[PDB]
Amino acid sequence: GWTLNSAGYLLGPHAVGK
């Protein structure tokens, strides 16, 4: 992502990171 997918939405299809 860039703003809505990186800063707005969370990423992690296989690897988790909180």
Token reading at 7: 């800063």
Residue 1 CB-density burial (10 A; 0-12 exposed, 13-18 middle, 19+ buried): exposed
- Residue whose pair of structure tokens reads 């690897």 in the numeric block: 15
Longest dimension (CA), the chain: 21
Residue 8 · residue 14 · CB < 8 Å: no
Task: Quote the CA–CA distance of 5 and 13 in Å, as a whole number.
Answer: 13
Count of residues in the chain: 18
- Which of 2, 4, 5 has its CA nearest to residue 13? 5
Q: 3-state SS of 1-18?
A: CCCCCCCCCCCCCCCCCC
- Alpha helices for 1-18 (secondary structure H): none
Cα separations in angstroms, 10 against 14, 18 = 13, 9
Chain-centre distance of CA 6, in angstroms? Answer: 5
Task: Quote the CA–CA distance of 13 and 17 in Å, as a whole number.
Answer: 11
